[PDB]
Design a protein around this ligand. Structure first.
Ligand SMILES: CC(=O)N[C@@H]1[C@@H](O[C@@H]2O[C@H](CO)[C@H](O)[C@H](O)[C@H]2O)[C@H](O[C@@H]2O[C@@H](C)[C@@H](O)[C@@H](O)[C@@H]2O)[C@@H](CO)O[C@H]1O
Ligand SMILES: [Ca+2]
Ligand SMILES: [Ca+2]
Length: 122
């Protein structure tokens, strides 16, 4: 699949569900990162755009209490790159996952209504 970053104006940021709908309207989904190669591809897109340290929705969303986090495209959550201490479900309201667009490419759980940039896969 091909990845595309969306870092529009800050008043153009979207919730997790709005971002999922945007990507699904293109016939795709929010990006799943299933291995280090995909991670590098996205990191290089970040460097090419020159937009460093920005946060982006990924396809991470909580499933049942038993499952924990899942990918919206149904891919397995085998590879994980959570930031240290994450997921921390801060204040019990963090059920979606974002990417921190710096070299570490780490993941964080955050409230799904938070406004973020996003990354689609097509
Ligand atoms: C600048 C600052 O002090 N931010 C605090 C939040 O931590 C940042 O959260 C963002 C989330 O996009 C990012 O992870 C930064 O690296 C953090 O410094 C803090 O958020 C809470 O703790 C985070 C570590 C993370 O788990 C986040 O999901 C969680 O809500 C909030 C709430 O304590 O306070 C901010 O001041
Ligand atoms: Ca993937
Ligand atoms: Ca968190």
């Amino acid at each position: 699949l091909c990845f595309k970053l969306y870092a529009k104006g800050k008043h153009e940021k979207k919730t997790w569900f709005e971002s999922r709908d945007f990507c699904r309207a293109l016939g795709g989904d929010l990006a799943s990162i299933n291995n280090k190669e995909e991670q590098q591809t996205i990191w290089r897109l970040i460097t090419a755009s020159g937009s460093y340290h920005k946060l982006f929705w990924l396809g991470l969303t909580y499933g049942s209490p038993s499952e924990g986090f899942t990918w919206s495209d149904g891919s397995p959550v085998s590879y994980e790159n959570w930031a240290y201490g994450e997921p921390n479900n801060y204040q019990n309201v963090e059920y979606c996952g974002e990417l921190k667009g710096d070299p570490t490419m780490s993941w964080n759980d955050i409230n799904c209504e938070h406004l973020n940039n996003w990354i689609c896969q097509i």
